Amino acid sequence: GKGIKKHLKRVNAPSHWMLNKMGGQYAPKTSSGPHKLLESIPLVILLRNRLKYALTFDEVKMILIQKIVKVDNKVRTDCTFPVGLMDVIHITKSNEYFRLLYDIKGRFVPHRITNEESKYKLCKVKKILLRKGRLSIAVTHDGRSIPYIHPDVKVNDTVRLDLETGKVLEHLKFQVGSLVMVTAGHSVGRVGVISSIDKNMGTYDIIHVKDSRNKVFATRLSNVFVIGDNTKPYISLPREKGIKLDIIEERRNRLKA
Amino acid sequence: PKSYRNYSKTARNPKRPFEKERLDQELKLIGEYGLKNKREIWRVQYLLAKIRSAARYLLTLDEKSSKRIFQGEALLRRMVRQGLLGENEEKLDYVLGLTLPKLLERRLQTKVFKLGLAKSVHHARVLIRQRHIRVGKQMVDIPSFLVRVDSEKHIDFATTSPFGGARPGRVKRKSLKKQKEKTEA
Amino acid sequence: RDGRHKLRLTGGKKKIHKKKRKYELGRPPSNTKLGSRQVHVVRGRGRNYKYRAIKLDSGSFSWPTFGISKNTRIIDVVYNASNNELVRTKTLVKNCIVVIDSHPFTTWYENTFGTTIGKSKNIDPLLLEQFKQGRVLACISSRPGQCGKADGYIIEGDELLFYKRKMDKRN
RNA sequence: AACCUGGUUGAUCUUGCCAGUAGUCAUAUGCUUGUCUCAAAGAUUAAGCCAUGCAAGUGAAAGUAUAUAUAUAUAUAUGUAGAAACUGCGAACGGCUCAUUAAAACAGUUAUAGUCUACUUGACAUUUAUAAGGAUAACUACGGAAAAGCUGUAGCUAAUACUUGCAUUAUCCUUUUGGAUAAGUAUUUGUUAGAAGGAAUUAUAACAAAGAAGUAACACGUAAAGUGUGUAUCAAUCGAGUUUCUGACCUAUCAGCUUUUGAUGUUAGGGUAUUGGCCUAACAUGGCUAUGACGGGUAACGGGGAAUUAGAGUUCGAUUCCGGAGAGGGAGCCUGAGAAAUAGCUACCACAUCUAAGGAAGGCAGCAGGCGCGUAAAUUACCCAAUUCUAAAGAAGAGAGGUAGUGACAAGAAAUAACAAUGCAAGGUUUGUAUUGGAAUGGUGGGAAUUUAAAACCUUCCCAGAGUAACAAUUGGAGGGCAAGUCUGGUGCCAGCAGCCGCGGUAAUUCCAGCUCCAAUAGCGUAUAUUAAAAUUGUUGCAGUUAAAACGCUCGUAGUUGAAUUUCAAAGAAUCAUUCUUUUUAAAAUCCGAUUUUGUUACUUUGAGUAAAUUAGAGUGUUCAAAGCAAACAGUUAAAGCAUUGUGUUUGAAUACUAUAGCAUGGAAUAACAAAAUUGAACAAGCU
RNA sequence: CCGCCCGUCGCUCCUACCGAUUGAAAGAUAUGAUGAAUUGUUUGGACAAGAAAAAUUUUUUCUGGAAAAACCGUAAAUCCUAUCUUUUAAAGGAAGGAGAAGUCGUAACAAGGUUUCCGUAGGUGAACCUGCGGAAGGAUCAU
RNA sequence: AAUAGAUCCGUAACUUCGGGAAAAGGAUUGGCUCUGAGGACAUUAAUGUUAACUCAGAACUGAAACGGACAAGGGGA
């Protein structure tokens, strides 16, 4: 037959998964869920190859059996569960909270997060639908459906979704001064203020983003994520703060120690 | 199926197999560096051609080209770390002038012979094979070991070697001597 | 059953590999006669059920000028734009012309307006005699081989005039 | 490393090829082979045939248990398990192979506003009830058949198997509150209104008809109310089917193809999940083609890639990954979300098994293995420990996969000594060199630590354990090309050698041998193919008077190529003498003297998307290297950092390339096309 | 130049060609004929369940329904015919190449003893000869 | 003796290019019920009256038969 493929070859795995060639012939195919396979990482990899808590898949299963790891404050027990771009995974045993982010290089890194920030996740809206009764519902990057959004929320906006109540608290627009983070581009993981946008009739829309050091980089509209206004980010960025350094000064300031 | 373990050649055959002058200079080099076979200097030329091609390509680029100020500095620092370049070097042109003896100077047997230890280059080779020498905290028995500028300071006899403070001498001769002494006494 | 085994744009024939897949499919047609209502069920792709009607006698028919739909019984299929063996063998297809019992529509008109929303429209004269005979002309609008029922709408105006000329400087 | 050399002649200079030369992740084969690491392996021919064994199953809270066993206070209420069986999910993934396939598949680039989509995730629902019905497996007993995943009759019983079936919400008025009004999820038809997209016959809403399927008659228990299973719709996700543009080898001794029999299009319908000549009916005569249609060939699966490369190029790509296809050859079909499935079924053809002769049963291009074919390719081994998949999802399986065996396919490191004294030679008491004679050390044998699923291997430690270190290195040559003998015997145009030129008839530098020497070296030859050499395929970059080669001549279409000309210029800051940066200078619309756009394309510049493996390349002492993607740092056991007492810390897994086509983008040059007169405008005023 | 050298005819071997034989074989297409299996529809119609009465039995009806059959459709397979592709037999015929001191002549290279050569045509044992028109690659760069 | 009419399809070697050729070799044909196409004539772009048998297609039907008798080539090397 020709049904859905259910295996993932090790070399065919996404690059940011960052697995070794000789470490077996297969990679864990993420179960279908809230995030795309390419745009996410299974929690098996998250806490075997990143947190190093478990050194085999079986120990990953042993961890997951105890309802101790919660993705967005709800217990998850699927080994190949897609965690996705930004969300709060809380481990109760060590009482630690990680918000998943990108880095300037473009891999998925857990970021240590305090309790007050761990109940406060960001969701980039992707679609605005209206169902029966003229009730509007937002489809977010998280694969989440939020009914009864404010009318002022637009298609590309980003809402602060509270983890417990699942309700939006406030939304951020996509003006030319809005802080943004690139999610899949050549400049994945970069953070900037959106210098400008341009609308292409019937084709991809490009936006040019200004860095902290006045560095302009362009990207497609489909893979940007508003993370705040001009004032400041609404989350805590990793140690590079989303500032991608050039290949020269990166070596230069790595050398000095 | 097929393993994903990469592997590659290290030497290129010379072509024109019976060039008199090339054969004579190869014999000069292998005899005076005490190496074992014509494959070794061919690996050395293969390596040297690699750095030479890198340097030529870099020098084709214009100055202030980020490719240049990255690859050229990486190559320069690598060369000065392996010891093929002195502090008086600053440019890639000086890299281009690297020669076969300047690359053969960094072999482990060459270095131990220069530092002493062995009074012959072949003696150095055989000692390295008999694992009597250490590059500091680690013992290597590969004569083609290339030392860096931070290693020659701590090349010395291996601690487990008889010349490094281990078991003194021929246990057979010592046992025979002690047995004869005990029988006579 | 679809998409291959035929000449290219240029007229050359294509050597065939990739024998028939299930998703090409192509089930046999449903020559829907008119008679006692009977419908079979066909399990299409993805377990979506389709209703293959074999015989129908009634259906929902609409008064489009008034925009009101009433269920009624069809009498006889008298024209179809496609091959005209379908009318002779009395099959129901998407847009064939049929005859409809007009009594439900006349009764509805009486009970709503009286006299033998968007009210007081003055109708048209040419449909009056067709009503008075008792049987009216309608065009099917559903796909009986797909939805399992034969719905339609009364044809009037120049469309009715066109079909009237096409059916009966005439034979 | 952007390379040449022998051979036509008496001798010369050419053209020109033959031969030599080197590489091949390129096969075979010959000789030889002491270590370790790494690891290709029945593709080539026979997608030929297969004995045997295995390769997909699944129950740890959670469908169904009087098969049965057990344990708690006393025949009671709880449990613990549980063969079989029904039910559920999976078996459509994986693995193998490359026969078919030449605008097909594939690749980049789109569309799906033309669709389907199980698991999983988020939202969320409409026209007897202190809980409804029969009917069946397992099992019981009677049986049949030589045989099989064969099953007959009678009797019960369950289920999350199969099937029926039980409040409420919203809206309008006086105006917290009282009255009044209305009630189908998808889907289909008809009539209308109409947050987003680029564009809607979109979302959605109103009216008139139909209308599925559902909304729990189900099982376990979490805060010092949860979960599981199941369910309508929408959305996400894992995917899929179609789809746009562009891109392929040889052949014209294939020039016209297609069109009754769908060829090209229109209309209507049928069919499909959806669009579509996909099919039907009517109609029209179209559609492709020297820019190579239609055919033929391919010892053709495509690509990522490989060899060779100075730059171009040439050749290869069955084979780690992706896509496609197939399961002896065809066709057909059931279940299912998903199959035209093949360790699923049905039939035919070719094979072929058992048979009591009545009848049954089959598909190794899965893993081993066998026959055959051949120049050409391994064990009927071990294990689920790692990677990962399936399940009722710790706990079971998995010839997937991993481990070992065979393995000179390739690739990397690297033994076969080293040292001191005399004697000898060379030199002004320095090197080389047959004697002695003590050190060093592996190979090897044994034990162990360790490793490992177990074992083996590596590493490490301890015993033994080298002088002809018998613990002995070979392969091919010694006329030239081409490094190395006119040394010695045999043969004597014979035998033979010789890639080519040539040698061999008594001095054979070439045969057969010995010695010596040369080259490479645990490797070295041979055959075939391929690349460079080959500027002997020539775009870069050949040649055509006489070496091969200007059509007999002219016209001529396609093709290729095409004179000049339209905005020139001027002025200012910064290194060294110069170089480099900035401003305005016609006209028309925008801003109350100032605010600002001024063909198309090629081409070129920048970006976005750029799967990995491979490649280039940054970092990193795997003892080096091939590698790999890791790792590094203080610490005879504690300072320091931070936390208001404990918690290791610092990291890296970069970057580039990813067509020529497609998207966006700055553009002055060079190229085209557009507009431009037997005319074509613009403005102002009046008129409609 | 006692140089070189050409062709026929003899002999041997190898390669390839033509070839009667309505030659042969193996495939591949196309048409036609027959046509298994089967989707769908229809016809059935073993029965299995319901509804009425008499106080074990009967009629009728309602669905659900197995064999079997027919018809469109999908269509394996076999056969006939035709064409094409590849391989291959063959009396005889006619080439080419190689071998050896074979036979016959002297064609070319010297003005090669008739200058050589081209195109065409005829003839002859062979090289070759001759006619017509050309060329110098001539034996003439020239009253 | 074998078909032999007509319609549709297909047709080789050879050739004086005209033929060969009805080459060879296939399929169909009845009856019935229908459907489509092919003309002429007058009035104020549209409505009526009327004729010929000739082709094409579809259902149904029968002991698969239909140029039903009559009539009427055997081909090929």
Tab-separated table of N, CA, C and O (backbone and C1' of nucleotides) in Angstrom, chain B residues 2-4 6-10 16 36-39 43 71 77-78 81 120 125 130-132 138 141 144 146 148 151 167 170, chain D residues 3 22 24-25 40 319-320 411-416 418-419 440-441 460 520-521 615 617-621 623 626-628:
chain	number	residue	atom	x	y	z
B	2	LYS	N	24.674	0.870	4.278
B	2	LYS	CA	26.021	1.419	4.243
B	2	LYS	C	26.258	2.324	5.442
B	2	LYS	O	25.417	3.162	5.779
B	3	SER	N	27.403	2.148	6.092
B	3	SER	CA	27.758	3.001	7.213
B	3	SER	C	28.037	4.417	6.733
B	3	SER	O	28.554	4.635	5.637
B	4	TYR	N	27.688	5.388	7.570
B	4	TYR	CA	27.893	6.790	7.250
B	4	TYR	C	29.259	7.295	7.685
B	4	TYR	O	29.443	8.507	7.834
B	6	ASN	N	32.697	8.499	7.042
B	6	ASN	CA	33.487	9.015	5.937
B	6	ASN	C	34.921	8.509	6.016
B	6	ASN	O	35.433	8.190	7.089
B	7	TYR	N	35.567	8.433	4.857
B	7	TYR	CA	36.976	8.077	4.786
B	7	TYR	C	37.526	8.599	3.471
B	7	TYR	O	36.790	8.736	2.493
B	8	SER	N	38.824	8.887	3.453
B	8	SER	CA	39.425	9.505	2.282
B	8	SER	C	40.899	9.144	2.203
B	8	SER	O	41.501	8.667	3.166
B	9	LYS	N	41.471	9.381	1.027
B	9	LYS	CA	42.883	9.140	0.791
B	9	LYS	C	43.731	10.164	1.534
B	9	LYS	O	43.253	11.217	1.960
B	10	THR	N	45.013	9.845	1.678
B	10	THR	CA	45.967	10.774	2.258
B	10	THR	C	47.189	11.017	1.392
B	10	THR	O	47.983	11.903	1.720
B	16	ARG	N	54.729	9.969	-13.713
B	16	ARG	CA	56.099	9.974	-14.209
B	16	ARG	C	56.949	9.220	-13.199
B	16	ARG	O	57.728	9.828	-12.456
B	36	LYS	N	60.343	5.856	6.632
B	36	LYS	CA	60.395	4.444	6.280
B	36	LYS	C	60.155	4.162	4.809
B	36	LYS	O	60.690	3.180	4.287
B	37	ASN	N	59.372	4.983	4.120
B	37	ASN	CA	58.874	4.553	2.826
B	37	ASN	C	58.437	5.765	2.013
B	37	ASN	O	58.186	6.842	2.557
B	38	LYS	N	58.360	5.576	0.693
B	38	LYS	CA	58.001	6.662	-0.212
B	38	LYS	C	56.559	7.115	-0.062
B	38	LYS	O	56.191	8.139	-0.639
B	39	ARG	N	55.721	6.380	0.662
B	39	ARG	CA	54.369	6.874	0.879
B	39	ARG	C	54.369	8.079	1.805
B	39	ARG	O	53.542	8.980	1.646
B	43	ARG	N	52.386	11.633	1.389
B	43	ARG	CA	51.355	12.200	2.255
B	43	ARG	C	51.714	13.619	2.646
B	43	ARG	O	50.840	14.488	2.757
B	71	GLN	N	38.887	33.063	6.542
B	71	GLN	CA	39.635	31.867	6.193
B	71	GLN	C	41.133	32.084	6.308
B	71	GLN	O	41.848	31.197	6.786
B	77	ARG	N	46.578	31.207	11.801
B	77	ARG	CA	46.679	30.789	13.188
B	77	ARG	C	46.893	29.290	13.294
B	77	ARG	O	47.668	28.848	14.147
B	78	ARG	N	46.273	28.501	12.417
B	78	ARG	CA	46.524	27.067	12.426
B	78	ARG	C	47.979	26.761	12.100
B	78	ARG	O	48.599	25.907	12.742
B	81	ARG	N	50.224	27.690	14.899
B	81	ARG	CA	50.034	26.757	16.000
B	81	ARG	C	50.762	25.446	15.746
B	81	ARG	O	51.366	24.888	16.668
B	120	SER	N	70.117	9.015	17.136
B	120	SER	CA	69.908	8.816	15.712
B	120	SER	C	68.438	9.029	15.400
B	120	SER	O	67.576	8.842	16.260
B	125	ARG	N	62.914	6.805	15.769
B	125	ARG	CA	61.790	6.077	15.194
B	125	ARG	C	61.520	4.796	15.969
B	125	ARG	O	60.376	4.502	16.339
B	130	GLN	N	58.599	1.592	20.151
B	130	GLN	CA	58.634	0.886	21.429
B	130	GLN	C	58.025	1.687	22.566
B	130	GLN	O	58.226	1.320	23.729
B	131	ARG	N	57.325	2.771	22.250
B	131	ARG	CA	56.530	3.562	23.197
B	131	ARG	C	57.323	3.907	24.456
B	131	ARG	O	57.010	3.493	25.571
B	132	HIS	N	58.370	4.698	24.251
B	132	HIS	CA	59.184	5.196	25.344
B	132	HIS	C	59.074	6.698	25.544
B	132	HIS	O	59.761	7.235	26.417
B	138	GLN	N	50.351	12.188	28.213
B	138	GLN	CA	49.858	11.214	27.251
B	138	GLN	C	51.013	10.689	26.416
B	138	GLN	O	51.836	11.464	25.924
B	141	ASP	N	52.850	6.499	20.386
B	141	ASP	CA	53.828	5.671	19.695
B	141	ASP	C	53.669	5.762	18.179
B	141	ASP	O	53.947	4.804	17.456
B	144	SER	N	54.771	9.600	13.062
B	144	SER	CA	54.295	10.712	12.254
B	144	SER	C	53.512	11.734	13.058
B	144	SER	O	52.866	12.600	12.463
B	146	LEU	N	52.565	14.981	14.676
B	146	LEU	CA	52.960	16.361	14.443
B	146	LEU	C	52.746	17.155	15.720
B	146	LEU	O	51.638	17.176	16.264
B	148	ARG	N	52.766	20.618	18.123
B	148	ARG	CA	52.457	22.034	18.041
B	148	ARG	C	53.449	22.827	18.881
B	148	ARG	O	54.265	22.269	19.616
B	151	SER	N	53.724	21.968	22.547
B	151	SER	CA	53.990	20.583	22.905
B	151	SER	C	55.464	20.250	23.052
B	151	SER	O	55.805	19.414	23.891
B	167	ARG	N	60.284	-0.340	35.454
B	167	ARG	CA	61.059	-1.563	35.644
B	167	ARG	C	62.448	-1.367	35.047
B	167	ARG	O	62.574	-1.058	33.856
B	170	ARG	N	66.591	-5.874	32.021
B	170	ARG	CA	66.211	-7.221	31.618
B	170	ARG	C	65.978	-8.116	32.824
B	170	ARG	O	66.916	-8.457	33.550
D	3	C	P	49.656	20.426	-18.324
D	3	C	O5'	51.185	20.317	-17.912
D	3	C	C5'	52.171	21.089	-18.580
D	3	C	C4'	53.332	20.238	-19.014
D	3	C	C3'	52.972	19.068	-19.924
D	3	C	O3'	53.999	18.888	-20.890
D	3	C	C1'	54.044	18.265	-17.976
D	22	A	P	52.290	4.556	-14.570
D	22	A	O5'	51.254	5.465	-13.784
D	22	A	C5'	51.708	6.568	-13.022
D	22	A	C4'	50.601	7.552	-12.756
D	22	A	C3'	49.299	6.975	-12.238
D	22	A	O3'	49.329	6.649	-10.865
D	22	A	C1'	48.825	8.483	-13.962
D	24	U	P	43.354	5.466	-7.481
D	24	U	O5'	41.875	5.379	-8.056
D	24	U	C5'	40.912	6.370	-7.740
D	24	U	C4'	39.693	6.237	-8.611
D	24	U	C3'	38.997	4.890	-8.562
D	24	U	O3'	38.109	4.793	-7.467
D	24	U	C1'	39.260	5.575	-10.812
D	25	C	P	38.313	3.670	-6.343
D	25	C	O5'	37.133	3.958	-5.314
D	25	C	C5'	36.251	2.921	-4.905
D	25	C	C4'	34.809	3.365	-4.939
D	25	C	C3'	34.511	4.559	-5.842
D	25	C	O3'	33.232	4.389	-6.446
D	25	C	C1'	33.825	5.044	-3.642
D	40	A	P	29.738	-1.058	5.019
D	40	A	O5'	29.662	-1.480	3.492
D	40	A	C5'	29.797	-0.511	2.470
D	40	A	C4'	30.181	-1.151	1.167
D	40	A	C3'	29.413	-2.403	0.790
D	40	A	O3'	28.138	-2.123	0.246
D	40	A	C1'	31.717	-2.737	0.408
D	319	U	P	19.328	2.895	-7.051
D	319	U	O5'	20.345	2.368	-5.953
D	319	U	C5'	20.027	1.245	-5.149
D	319	U	C4'	21.211	0.822	-4.324
D	319	U	C3'	21.836	1.909	-3.473
D	319	U	O3'	21.142	2.097	-2.257
D	319	U	C1'	23.529	0.724	-4.620
D	320	U	P	20.481	3.514	-1.907
D	320	U	O5'	20.554	3.563	-0.322
D	320	U	C5'	21.730	3.141	0.351
D	320	U	C4'	21.668	3.452	1.821
D	320	U	C3'	20.979	4.764	2.169
D	320	U	O3'	20.359	4.638	3.444
D	320	U	C1'	23.218	4.841	2.892
D	411	A	P	42.431	2.106	-1.342
D	411	A	O5'	42.171	2.971	-0.036
D	411	A	C5'	41.372	4.139	-0.100
D	411	A	C4'	41.027	4.646	1.273
D	411	A	C3'	42.168	4.688	2.267
D	411	A	O3'	43.015	5.804	2.094
D	411	A	C1'	40.303	3.703	3.286
D	412	G	P	44.572	5.676	2.445
D	412	G	O5'	44.612	5.806	4.028
D	412	G	C5'	44.101	6.961	4.671
D	412	G	C4'	44.193	6.836	6.166
D	412	G	C3'	45.535	6.383	6.706
D	412	G	O3'	46.479	7.431	6.783
D	412	G	C1'	43.831	5.134	7.729
D	413	A	P	48.043	7.105	6.672
D	413	A	O5'	48.409	6.499	8.093
D	413	A	C5'	48.307	7.291	9.262
D	413	A	C4'	48.457	6.451	10.500
D	413	A	C3'	49.742	5.654	10.605
D	413	A	O3'	50.836	6.426	11.061
D	413	A	C1'	47.922	4.258	11.111
D	414	A	P	52.297	6.181	10.449
D	414	A	O5'	52.627	4.678	10.841
D	414	A	C5'	52.815	4.307	12.196
D	414	A	C4'	52.935	2.816	12.328
D	414	A	C3'	54.059	2.183	11.529
D	414	A	O3'	55.303	2.261	12.200
D	414	A	C1'	52.061	0.996	11.144
D	415	A	P	56.625	1.632	11.546
D	415	A	O5'	56.587	0.112	12.008
D	415	A	C5'	57.656	-0.765	11.706
D	415	A	C4'	57.620	-1.992	12.577
D	415	A	C3'	58.723	-3.003	12.330
D	415	A	O3'	59.932	-2.655	12.977
D	415	A	C1'	56.650	-4.119	12.424
D	416	U	P	61.281	-2.466	12.128
D	416	U	O5'	61.498	-3.882	11.442
D	416	U	C5'	61.755	-5.034	12.228
D	416	U	C4'	61.708	-6.285	11.394
D	416	U	C3'	62.579	-6.278	10.151
D	416	U	O3'	63.924	-6.613	10.430
D	416	U	C1'	60.415	-7.034	9.591
D	418	A	P	68.243	-0.507	11.895
D	418	A	O5'	68.323	0.028	13.390
D	418	A	C5'	67.584	1.168	13.797
D	418	A	C4'	67.840	1.484	15.246
D	418	A	C3'	69.299	1.657	15.630
D	418	A	O3'	69.786	2.954	15.352
D	418	A	C1'	68.249	0.218	17.172
D	419	C	P	71.347	3.172	15.072
D	419	C	O5'	72.034	2.881	16.478
D	419	C	C5'	71.855	3.767	17.572
D	419	C	C4'	72.427	3.202	18.847
D	419	C	C3'	73.919	2.925	18.850
D	419	C	O3'	74.690	4.090	19.074
D	419	C	C1'	72.769	1.090	19.796
D	440	A	P	65.584	-3.541	29.020
D	440	A	O5'	64.888	-2.905	27.745
D	440	A	C5'	64.878	-1.501	27.553
D	440	A	C4'	64.220	-1.154	26.248
D	440	A	C3'	63.008	-1.999	25.900
D	440	A	O3'	61.825	-1.561	26.535
D	440	A	C1'	64.453	-1.936	24.054
D	441	U	P	60.780	-2.639	27.092
D	441	U	O5'	59.869	-2.956	25.832
D	441	U	C5'	59.428	-1.909	24.987
D	441	U	C4'	59.180	-2.408	23.591
D	441	U	C3'	58.236	-3.584	23.469
D	441	U	O3'	56.880	-3.195	23.543
D	441	U	C1'	60.134	-3.946	22.113
D	460	U	P	47.625	-0.012	25.579
D	460	U	O5'	47.402	-0.326	27.119
D	460	U	C5'	47.014	0.700	28.016
D	460	U	C4'	46.643	0.129	29.357
D	460	U	C3'	47.612	-0.888	29.926
D	460	U	O3'	48.743	-0.290	30.526
D	460	U	C1'	45.405	-1.688	30.156
D	520	A	P	60.412	3.924	-5.383
D	520	A	O5'	59.073	3.142	-5.038
D	520	A	C5'	57.873	3.420	-5.740
D	520	A	C4'	56.862	2.323	-5.547
D	520	A	C3'	56.668	1.854	-4.121
D	520	A	O3'	55.827	2.696	-3.366
D	520	A	C1'	56.900	-0.016	-5.518
D	521	U	P	56.199	2.971	-1.839
D	521	U	O5'	55.952	1.573	-1.122
D	521	U	C5'	54.662	0.987	-1.097
D	521	U	C4'	54.728	-0.486	-0.784
D	521	U	C3'	55.231	-0.853	0.599
D	521	U	O3'	54.231	-0.735	1.592
D	521	U	C1'	56.294	-2.209	-1.012
D	615	U	P	33.004	14.399	1.944
D	615	U	O5'	32.822	15.719	1.078
D	615	U	C5'	33.073	15.708	-0.317
D	615	U	C4'	32.918	17.077	-0.923
D	615	U	C3'	33.690	18.193	-0.254
D	615	U	O3'	35.065	18.185	-0.583
D	615	U	C1'	31.504	18.931	-0.744
D	617	G	P	38.751	23.224	2.335
D	617	G	O5'	37.992	24.011	3.490
D	617	G	C5'	37.887	25.425	3.460
D	617	G	C4'	36.922	25.927	4.503
D	617	G	C3'	37.233	25.536	5.936
D	617	G	O3'	38.224	26.348	6.531
D	617	G	C1'	34.973	25.092	5.500
D	618	A	P	39.023	25.819	7.816
D	618	A	O5'	38.153	26.340	9.039
D	618	A	C5'	37.921	27.726	9.225
D	618	A	C4'	37.164	27.985	10.499
D	618	A	C3'	37.618	27.187	11.708
D	618	A	O3'	38.745	27.759	12.344
D	618	A	C1'	35.269	27.080	11.532
D	619	G	P	39.865	26.819	13.000
D	619	G	O5'	39.163	26.246	14.303
D	619	G	C5'	38.642	27.119	15.291
D	619	G	C4'	37.849	26.358	16.317
D	619	G	C3'	38.536	25.137	16.896
D	619	G	O3'	39.451	25.466	17.922
D	619	G	C1'	36.318	24.589	16.305
D	620	U	P	40.788	24.604	18.108
D	620	U	O5'	40.267	23.206	18.653
D	620	U	C5'	39.550	23.129	19.873
D	620	U	C4'	38.917	21.776	20.041
D	620	U	C3'	39.838	20.591	19.834
D	620	U	O3'	40.651	20.324	20.959
D	620	U	C1'	37.828	20.232	18.661
D	621	G	P	42.211	20.699	20.923
D	621	G	O5'	42.912	19.352	20.456
D	621	G	C5'	42.916	18.208	21.299
D	621	G	C4'	43.260	16.961	20.530
D	621	G	C3'	43.448	15.708	21.376
D	621	G	O3'	42.945	14.577	20.673
D	621	G	C1'	45.450	16.187	20.195
D	623	U	P	42.756	7.853	21.545
D	623	U	O5'	43.973	8.822	21.232
D	623	U	C5'	44.615	9.543	22.269
D	623	U	C4'	46.054	9.800	21.920
D	623	U	C3'	46.316	10.103	20.459
D	623	U	O3'	46.055	11.454	20.137
D	623	U	C1'	47.884	8.515	21.237
D	626	A	P	42.476	13.161	9.060
D	626	A	O5'	41.681	11.916	8.475
D	626	A	C5'	42.082	11.336	7.246
D	626	A	C4'	41.517	9.953	7.060
D	626	A	C3'	40.039	9.786	7.338
D	626	A	O3'	39.230	10.274	6.289
D	626	A	C1'	41.237	7.979	8.274
D	627	A	P	38.208	11.476	6.569
D	627	A	O5'	37.063	10.798	7.435
D	627	A	C5'	36.792	11.245	8.751
D	627	A	C4'	36.738	10.096	9.722
D	627	A	C3'	35.655	10.192	10.780
D	627	A	O3'	34.399	9.740	10.311
D	627	A	C1'	37.706	9.698	11.820
D	628	G	P	33.209	10.783	10.056
D	628	G	O5'	32.473	10.869	11.461
D	628	G	C5'	32.281	9.709	12.254
D	628	G	C4'	32.335	10.042	13.721
D	628	G	C3'	31.527	11.255	14.146
D	628	G	O3'	30.171	10.930	14.379
D	628	G	C1'	33.698	11.356	15.093
